[PDB]
Amino acid sequence: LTKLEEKLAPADSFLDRHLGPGETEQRQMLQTLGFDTLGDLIDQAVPPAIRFPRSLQLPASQSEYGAIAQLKSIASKNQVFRSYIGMGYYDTITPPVIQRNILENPGWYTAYTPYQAEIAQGRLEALLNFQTMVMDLTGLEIANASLLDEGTAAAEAMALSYGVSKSKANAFFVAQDCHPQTIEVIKTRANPLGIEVIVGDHHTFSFSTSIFGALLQYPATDGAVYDYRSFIDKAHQHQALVTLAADPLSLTLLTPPGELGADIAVGSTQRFGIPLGYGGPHAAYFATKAEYQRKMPGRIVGVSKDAHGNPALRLALQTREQHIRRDKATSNICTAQVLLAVMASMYGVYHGSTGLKNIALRIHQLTVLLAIGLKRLNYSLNNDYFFDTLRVGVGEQSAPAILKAAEGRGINLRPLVPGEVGISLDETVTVQDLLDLWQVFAGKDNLPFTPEELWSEVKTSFPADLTRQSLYLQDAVFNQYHSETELLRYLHQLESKDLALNTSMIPLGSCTMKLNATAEMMPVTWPEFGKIHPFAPAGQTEGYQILFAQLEAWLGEITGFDAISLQPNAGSQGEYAGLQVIRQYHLSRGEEQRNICLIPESAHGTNPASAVMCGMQVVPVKCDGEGNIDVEDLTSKAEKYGDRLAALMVTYPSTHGVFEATIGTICDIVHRFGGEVYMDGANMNAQVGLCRPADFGADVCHLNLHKTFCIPHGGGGPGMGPIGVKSHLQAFLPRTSLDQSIGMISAAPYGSASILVISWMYIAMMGPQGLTKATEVAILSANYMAKRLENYYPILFRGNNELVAHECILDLRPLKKQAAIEVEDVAKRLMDFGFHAPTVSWPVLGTMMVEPTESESLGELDRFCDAMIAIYQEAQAITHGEIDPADNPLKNAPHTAQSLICGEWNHPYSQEEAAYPAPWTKQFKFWPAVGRINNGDRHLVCSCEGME
Amino acid sequence: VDLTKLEEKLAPADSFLDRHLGPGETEQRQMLQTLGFDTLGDLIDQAVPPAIRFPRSLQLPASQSEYGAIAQLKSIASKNQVFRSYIGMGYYDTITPPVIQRNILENPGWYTAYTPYQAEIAQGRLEALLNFQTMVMDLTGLEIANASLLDEGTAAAEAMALSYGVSKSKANAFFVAQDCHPQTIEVIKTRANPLGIEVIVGDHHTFSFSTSIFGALLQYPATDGAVYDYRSFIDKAHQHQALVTLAADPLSLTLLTPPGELGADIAVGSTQRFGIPLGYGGPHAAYFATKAEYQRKMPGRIVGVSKDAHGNPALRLAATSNICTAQVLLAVMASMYGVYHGSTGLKNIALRIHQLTVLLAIGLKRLNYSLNNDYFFDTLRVGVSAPAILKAAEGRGINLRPLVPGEVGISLDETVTVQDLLDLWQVFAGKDNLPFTPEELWSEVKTSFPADLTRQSLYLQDAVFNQYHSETELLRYLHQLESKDLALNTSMIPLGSCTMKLNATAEMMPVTWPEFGKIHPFAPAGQTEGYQILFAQLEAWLGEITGFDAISLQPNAGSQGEYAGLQVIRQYHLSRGEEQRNICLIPESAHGTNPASAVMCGMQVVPVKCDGEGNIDVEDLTSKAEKYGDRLAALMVTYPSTHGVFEATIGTICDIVHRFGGEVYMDGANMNAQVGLCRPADFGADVCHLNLHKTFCIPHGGGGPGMGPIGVKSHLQAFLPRTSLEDQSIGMISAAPYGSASILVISWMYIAMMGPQGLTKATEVAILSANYMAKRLENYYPILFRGNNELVAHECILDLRPLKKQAAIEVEDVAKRLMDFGFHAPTVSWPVLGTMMVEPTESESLGELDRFCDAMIAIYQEAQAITHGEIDPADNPLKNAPHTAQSLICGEWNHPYSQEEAAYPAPWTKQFKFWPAVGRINRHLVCSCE
Ligand SMILES: [Cl-]
Ligand SMILES: [Cl-]
């Protein structure tokens, strides 16, 4: 068969679809570089000492059609139950128009963070809608653009609360009826910080122990609705901030955290039409009082002005605070769950306040009806008040029998304690479902009541003093797009403002903006993956178990690590998990004093943030004068701190894009002094099939599946950051269910499980040969671009035949010295050529880092190079005094259509020179939606963006 | 029951009717207020004549939520079985590239616009269509190709009609090879009957040509897979001045010498194999190619290259035929398959299929079976118990083709793997251990068609077929074309007579479920139970809506519906021994497809006058009915009229026709004014067609035929087209028993989600919105043809002729100027020359309606400025529209108006601007709207 099929005319190959440059184009590019074969270039680019000497051991590549069919048979092994398990995840109905035109639209999911706000106004507006929706619902004044999941959001509230206090308190109170995974995430975050987590009963908590904060669940995990006002008042007189983890759908009916006096509200917006996803992805919310706005973690959309005085949005950063409490108040998050926040905000837009309230009201009414019927069947109910969740006492002999009978109908209930079961209803629930529940509990299909007769007993089952009266979602945007046609057009208008991968290459250094192929994306929205509750019984998730087993083995082979955790749900979470595992390792050997983390001064700012969150003390390691890592400063500090040494965090190849052939020795050094080596996987697209982190001395790494392995960038999302570890660290990995484990890094055991299918598909379609070729072509394209631009812009940090790896760093500092042109000028001017800028001013201030990836055609690479060459000449005209140095296209970019068409034109250049500076713009023109937005040095944590 | 009563108590759930309707309750009351009515019911009572008002609720299932309707259809779909069908017969499983599926077929930017009437804002799909034509031209080796036809059978029937019109032969006979696909032969006979054409079905091997023919149709490769050299046959046909058509598989043409090189005059075929779902019959784009010497009588639409006002390249869409559409969406998909794969990719797909087929053949031979095709491409004719072979195949989820006793056919395709090959061998062997090893057979593998038919000529050598092979490049190319086109995701397209309403996501979703999209139209009945349920339900529901006793879902275009309906009437009169009844009465304001359909049916058209108020002249009708009483076949009517009027005389009109022995056919163009409010059968129509792509939400596809089912009274039921391959059936109207079956799920979903209450409300709101627009515009443009109580129905006709008198402004000036405001024009110059007919539908919001009215009002003021000498009568925005960005930005500006006045004439254009891709590009008797 195999040898028979090899004889047949070639079939459609996914590798060819994924690679931008074909064979012909590759030969052209090699010729400009001066190499006969790609193999020759790669032999010079990669140091023999670390070159992986064999083929990756992975399943042979399949066609798109074949991979889909294989994954379909795997998916068919999952069972889609009606899960009434609750615990922070509830089935919901994604309006088809949103599923098709957002979730299944590359126009919405292919861009990354809105670094270049002028060409991201569409998704920034949807995020602003998300924030408004969260503010209205929570009754709190400030809301960010979303966080990873509910549990991590709660941990961010804990950190903020510690930073605000001025007392001797080191305890944080967590109610024992918070969701259990939330408590686990908080404990895991508290451990390296030395924070005492007190898990207790809010009813009886004495406040005899000083706390800086308290977390309460609203409604509680068992469904109970409580009035938290007196707790909140007592907490305040003890100087603690109170955070409510509050179900946002419930807030359409219940008095909100703001009005109860709470200081912070967090929760999941999953119920706003986001698939269960077997854990994710879902956007969590975070809201607080205006007095704490400067301490807000993560990203937040603000309203600014453009150069024409018109309103424009930008994605702001947490302002950098200097204070004695920074060591426990640090956050490492630079992203938002953008795509999912867009989806949740659009759910609110489509339903309106009345539609949302009606959804909640119907859930409540069905829940009340369920309760009445259960009582008529002589079960006991334990919640005095509730929204959507009942706590049913059944008799400790009968509980497993009830759960098994429910399963017999394709229904999951929540096993509470023996003699008790929980039931959470949701938007999908019908009267037919209600009848199934009754019959299950009755043990027969004939009931001693008729469903309709029970209606007279139905009434609001939460107290009057918690019955919300205040309004929400009153702004026009939530009232005017309720027909499918109007929402369709609203989505299209927003999408059209944004430059995504369906327009042009976005060559973001360190971000790997490669192809997010349709076949990879398709299975995400199969219900067998999308409609599974994360806490469903193992018997119903055999397909996911297979998916996990295979992905773990494959990523393990690519990295060379012995074990993989698929849990961490962001790049930053991967770093954090990796450091946590290292910390736990030293603890397991009785060495609680190894807390020094060596970090190269060129590192992305999330690295030391993550280290600080792990209770580590960062020690900077210096760079060369040739831009490589300085071994002697490393050694000097590896000695000075030698018996305190916990870790070295390194990126390979370097953040400067260098294949440092000294990598194995650096590792050999750290080990000599007792430390472990962690590799940041940002630059892993230069490695796949060419070298393996475990082989050169790394003990743990994380991978960015949303970079190297095709999960889309989501308009700014966290993606997934699984970690690989060697055998000696295996015992410490995050738990895969609800023991030397560090605990839980993400709320869900497999993080955002549903998007893992994308990376599975990529590997299945590429195979060993495909994955390796992709790496080699990415290196080819970077070197090609470097070679084309080297006479215009100095290329920094070369080899080794003076080659680069997968990215090239352009030095724009001469343009400032010669023409007073700033890197931001070049970035906006690129928009007029139809391009999103590459990475700006990181790792080197005043430069650009360009990463084309392997997915972009020679034609597209040449156009970008031609744009940069055109911009060089514009700068020359300034330098030579041929144009006004203050009034020129570079200073005035981006140019909107209106600015060129309306009003008086007083520029020493033509409207044509402004809008059509290259031939291709006259065939297809992308219009910047707004002029340059108001407001050099990089943020200290989110290093690729401007300081706040 | 008790659950229903309990459910009604609960807080309201998301209602599909609310999503479908543009105006909400608040907007509706605001519109009723401007009209002078307190309730919608008061308006409708005055709009619909009480004598024809349907007096009860439609009897249809209560509405379901989007979520619930999807779940119900899913349980129906799960009753279908997706087999590996190697049946062939003109349908072959194929791989739709996922990037094309997601970004074209499941993209409203591609499927929501209609025909490119306004070419300046349709350059995207026009270019994709140009690509389709180039692809067909290259593959067939013939010079002129149209933008596609409905299906293979009807395209072959169009070829017959072309041949009849241009052949110099005095013969009246058309030869059809007996090894053409069986359904093709049926469609040809059905089209030939009313024309008096003799169809000769025979063996092309032995046909003597002593019998004179004007045309011949040959299948390449043949239906049983045999590949023949038709050169000698073609030469003899030419000796007799007959035209030869080859029905040629376009994939096979990557390997086989093409029709153009064999001497053929016309080539037709299906492009379904170019990545289009089986669809249980459709929709698929058929191709039609021919020579320049025959060009003038070729059917359908053809994209041409022209120039715009700036001298830049621009596209436009240039034995009678009634076809005005092309299968646009599917032609786009077929051409993008060609663009994605390129010449090499296509040839490799074909070559692998052939190699697999030769391998299959060698293996079957080792197993002592007889192989009957000397030469073949993808299809084997296998001689033996054939029933036991077929049954054994079914046991592995495989369908083979039952030929004659002792013979089975096997057609391989793009999805076939060596594992599938192994399966076929084991079936025929009778065990899993074969007396050979798969790899061992490779040595005997050789090209199994002759050198004399081995293609050497190249194809798809243009750059477009060579530059978009990565997924990223294709995604971007698709995005750029899409971006040029104005579709329903941009703004309302209020085309009178086209009903541009919401094509809801939930309705579209099931089209691409494998259980609907991946079923072969000739799969065994036991595998298609879900479709059987779908058809039964749809037939019952459409019958209740129309009042008819029986529905045929077969006709696969609006024009096919008219044609089918008239064929049924013709057959009725034949059944009564009254062939002399061939007079078709048609109002003079009718769409041109109506008389063309009648002529195709062998009928003689007699026009009927409109009166001084633009209603059917009852006296004239009565006089003509009486005059042609002895010969009266039919009256064709639209209701409400083509002038948009609910005539109170419709029942009287039907009575007069019946009194003189005619039947009444109703064109369903205006059914969006009727649903729930009146029923064609109830007022006297004997048959009608419905346009499912207008009234019932099938997308307009960028110009597609949609589906045109007919409803008939019991006395016509015997004559309906057959639903499977003595009876009184007219035969076959479409190639597939249920036409484009996969898209029928869209109308099922709409009816399931709307319910009887929703369907009726939709109609009422459509009438409300048209009346609202007329009231807003009446002071600026005279409203023509108001009905009783001075109300219109679902559309209003704006008189633009005063603008011509006062300002020398033409309707085309206004149509292009609307582009600068971000709107696609309404229907231009039909049914009344120099006017516009606007149909908003119920799906557009009050905000959108007001913007369109405001644009028309602003344009009225621009005309006034010309009239009053405030601006140059020749150099003004109306004459220079549409304005491209480049024209406003590049070169010298010498107009007396500003660039801002050109590009931003309304405030909304400063919030969102749609840019016309080209400047202005430099009445048809059939396709009347163009
Ligand atoms: Cl491989
Ligand atoms: Cl209803």
Curated annotation (Swiss-Prot), chain B:
Keywords: Oxidoreductase, Pyridoxal phosphate. The keyword Oxidoreductase applies. It comes from the Bacteria. One of its GO terms (biological process) is glycine decarboxylation via glycine cleavage system. CDD domains: GDC-P (cd00613). It holds the Pfam family GcvP2_C. It is an enzyme of class 1 (oxidoreductase). One of its GO terms (molecular function) is glycine binding. The modification N6-(pyridoxal phosphate)lysine is found at residue 694. It catalyses: N(6)-[(R)-lipoyl]-L-lysyl-[glycine-cleavage complex H protein] + glycine + H(+) = N(6)-[(R)-S(8)-aminomethyldihydrolipoyl]-L-lysyl-[glycine-cleavage complex H protein] + CO2. Its EC number is 1.4.4.2. InterPro entries: GcvP (IPR003437), GDC-P_C (IPR049316), GDC-P_N (IPR049315), GDC_P (IPR020581), PyrdxlP-dep_Trfase (IPR015424), PyrdxlP-dep_Trfase_major (IPR015421), PyrdxlP-dep_Trfase_small (IPR015422). Its cofactor is pyridoxal 5'-phosphate. One of its GO terms (cellular component) is cytosol. The glycine cleavage system is composed of four proteins: P, T, L and H. Belongs to the GcvP family. HAMAP family: GcvP (MF_00711). The glycine cleavage system catalyzes the degradation of glycine. The P protein binds the alpha-amino group of glycine through its pyridoxal phosphate cofactor; CO(2) is released and the remaining methylamine moiety is then transferred to the lipoamide cofactor of the H protein. This is Glycine dehydrogenase (decarboxylating). It comes from Synechocystis sp. (strain ATCC 27184 / PCC 6803 / Kazusa).
